[PDB]
C-alpha cells in the first residue's frame, strides 16, 4: 500500500497547494497573464502572415501525434472543407519488387473508385474525421452514427450488446480522450470473391463506465479509470452511395477492440 | 498486357480424358486465379471449378469427381483434366482470370471440344 | 446453387435507344452489402468479355454506355444508346457462392 498511500499524500499535498491561498492567487494571477499574452498577439494572429506561417509549420499534421477531435470541431472542420476544400537474378528480383500484389490490388480498386484516394489521403480521412467518429460513438452508444459505419455483420454484434445493458437498464456514456496510431495496417482481399479491405488500427485513450438509467450511478468501470486500447477495423467501400454525406461510401465489415490497458 | 492462351486437344474419344493447359502471361498465379468455365451450346455457360488466388482448388459439384485443377507458379500454367468425356461434355472450355469481385476480366481464347468418333 | 434467370431471352431495338436486360437471381447475391452480379458480354466466336462487375463497376475499358443496376434479386443491364457494334449475347453471373451460374443469356439485335 505504499504506492496508493503516497499518491494519497501526493494528490492531497497538491490539492493543498491549489487550494492555497498563496497558490490560488499565483495560478489566476499567471491566468491573466496568459489572457492578455494572447489579446496582446490576437492582432498578430489574424495577420495573412501568420495563417500562412502557422500552415507552415503545423498544416495540421501534427494530428498524427495524438489528440481527440471534438463532435462539434470535427463536423464544423468537415463541412467547411466540404465547402471550399474537399469540393541477373537481382534484376529478376527487382523485377518482381515492381510487380502487382495483393495490396496493389486492393489500393488500386479505391482509387478507381475515387481518383483522389491514396494511403496518405485517407489515413487523413480516418485521423481526422473517421476513426474519432466511430470510436466516440462505440464508448457513447450511439447507434445512429454505428448504423451508417457498420455493416450488418458488426452492428448486430454491437446492437445485441446494447440490448443486454438496456435489460439492466444501464446506459453507455464513456469517454474518447486521446486517438493514436491511426493507421491502415494492411490492404487484403477478403477471399474468395476478393473483397478488397483495408485494416485500420488505432490506439485510443478512454473512459469506460456506464449509469444506471433511472438513478445514474456507477454501474461500471470507474469515472477516473484511463484505458489504452488499441481497435482493428475493416474498411471496404461500396461503389453505390459512394455520394452519401457522411460515409461517402465507406463501411466498416470488422470491428474488434483489444490490447486494453490502464494509462494515464 | 494479360493474356490467356489454351492448349487441349479438339475431338476427345468417348470415356477419355481432356486436358486443357491455360499458360498466362502478364499476371502471376500467385496474386490472381483462373476460373474454369465451360460453354455448350444446348446448356449454355457453365462453371466447372476454379483455381483460387490462394492456391487451393474448387469444382462444380456435378463435376468434382471428375475434374482435376492444377497449376504451376513458375511456368506460370494451370492445368485442367476431366476423367471421363461423354458426349454431353463437347464444348467450348474457358480460363478465366478473376479479379477483384470475382470479376472473369481476362478470357482465354476457348479450347473447342469435341467427343465423338 | 442460385438460378439466374434472365429476361427477355431475345430482344430487338433499334439504334440508338435503351436496351433493358434483367435478371432475377432465386436467392440475394450480397455479400456485405455488395451485390456480386457480373455482366458479360459474348460476340459469336469470342469469349465472353466482362461488362460489368460488383453490379455497377464498368469493366476496364468498358464503354460508359453499358449501365448495370438493381440489388437483392433484380438486376439489370442497360444499353444506351445503342450502336451496331454491341449486338451480342448477354449473360448475368452471380459470384456470390459455388457454384458460380450464369444467366441464360439474352440475344440482343438490330430492328
Known amino acids: 500500500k505504499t504506492l496508493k498511500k503516497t499518491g494519497e499524500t501526493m494528490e492531497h499535498i497538491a490539492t493543498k497547494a491549489w487550494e492555497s491561498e498563496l497558490g490560488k492567487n499565483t495560478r489566476k494571477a499567471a491566468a491573466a497573464t496568459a489572457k492578455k499574452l494572447d489579446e496582446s498577439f490576437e492582432p498578430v494572429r489574424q495577420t495573412k502572415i501568420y495563417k500562412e506561417v502557422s500552415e507552415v509549420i503545423d498544416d495540421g499534421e501534427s494530428s498524427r501525434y495524438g489528440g481527440f477531435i471534438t463532435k462539434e470541431q470535427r463536423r464544423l472542420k468537415r463541412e467547411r472543407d466540404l465547402a471550399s476544400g474537399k469540393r541477373r537474378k537481382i534484376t529478376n528480383k527487382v523485377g518482381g519488387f515492381f510487380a502487382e500484389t495483393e495490396s496493389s490490388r486492393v489500393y488500386s480498386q479505391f482509387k478507381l473508385m475515387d481518383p483522389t484516394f491514396s494511403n496518405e489521403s485517407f489515413t487523413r480521412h480516418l485521423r481526422e474525421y473517421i476513426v474519432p467518429e466511430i470510436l466516440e460513438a462505440y464508448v457513447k452508444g450511439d447507434v445512429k452514427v454505428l448504423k451508417k459505419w457498420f455493416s450488418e455483420a458488426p452492428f448486430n454484434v454491437y446492437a445485441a450488446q446494447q440490448k443486454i445493458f438496456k435489460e439492466q437498464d444501464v446506459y453507455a456514456d464513456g469517454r474518447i480522450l486521446d486517438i493514436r496510431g491511426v493507421e491502415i495496417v494492411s490492404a487484403k482481399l477478403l477471399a474468395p470473391q476478393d473483397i478488397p479491405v483495408l485494416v485500420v488500427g488505432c490506439r485510443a485513450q478512454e473512459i469506460n463506465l456506464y449509469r444506471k438509467k433511472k438513478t445514474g450511478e456507477i454501474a461500471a468501470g470507474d469515472e477516473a479509470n484511463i484505458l489504452m486500447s488499441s481497435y482493428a477495423m475493416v474498411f471496404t467501400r461500396d461503389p453505390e452511395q459512394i455520394d452519401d454525406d457522411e460515409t461517402e461510401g465507406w463501411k466498416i465489415l470488422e470491428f474488434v477492440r483489444g490490447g486494453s490497458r490502464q494509462f494515464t | 498486357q494479360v493474356q490467356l492462351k489454351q492448349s487441349g486437344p479438339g475431338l476427345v474419344q468417348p470415356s477419355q480424358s481432356l486436358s486443357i493447359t491455360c499458360t498466362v502471361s502478364?499476371?502471376?498465379?500467385?496474386?490472381?486465379?483462373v476460373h474454369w468455365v465451360r460453354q455448350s451450346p444446348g446448356k449454355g455457360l457453365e462453371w466447372l471449378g476454379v483455381?483460387?488466388?490462394?492456391?487451393?482448388?474448387d469444382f462444380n459439384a456435378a463435376f468434382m469427381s471428375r475434374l482435376s485443377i492444377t497449376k504451376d507458379n513458375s511456368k506460370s500454367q494451370v492445368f485442367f483434366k476431366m476423367n471421363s468425356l461423354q458426349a454431353d461434355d463437347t464444348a467450348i472450355y474457358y480460363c478465366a482470370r478473376y479479379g477483384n469481385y470475382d470479376a472473369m476480366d481476362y478470357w482465354g481464347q476457348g479450347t473447342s471440344v469435341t467427343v465423338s468418333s | 446453387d442460385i438460378v439466374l434467370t434472365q429476361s427477355p431471352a431475345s430482344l430487338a431495338v433499334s439504334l440508338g435507344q435503351r436496351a433493358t436486360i434483367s435478371c432475377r437471381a432465386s436467392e440475394s447475391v450480397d455479400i456485405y452489402g455488395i451485390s456480386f452480379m457480373n455482366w458479360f458480354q459474348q460476340k459469336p466466336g469470342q469469349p465472353p468479355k466482362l461488362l460489368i462487375y460488383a453490379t455497377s463497376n464498368q469493366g476496364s475499358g468498358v464503354p460508359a454506355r453499358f449501365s448495370g443496376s438493381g440489388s437483392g434479386t433484380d438486376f439489370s443491364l442497360n444499353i444506351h444508346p445503342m450502336e451496331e457494334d454491341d449486338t451480342a449475347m448477354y449473360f448475368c453471373?452471380?459470384?456470390?457462392?459455388?457454384?458460380?451460374?450464369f444467366g441464360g443469356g439474352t440475344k440482343l439485335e438490330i430492328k
Open positions: 453471373q452471380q459470384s456470390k457462392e459455388v457454384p458460380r451460374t
Open positions: 483455381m483460387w488466388r490462394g492456391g487451393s482448388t
Open positions: 502478364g499476371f502471376s498465379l500467385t496474386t490472381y486465379g
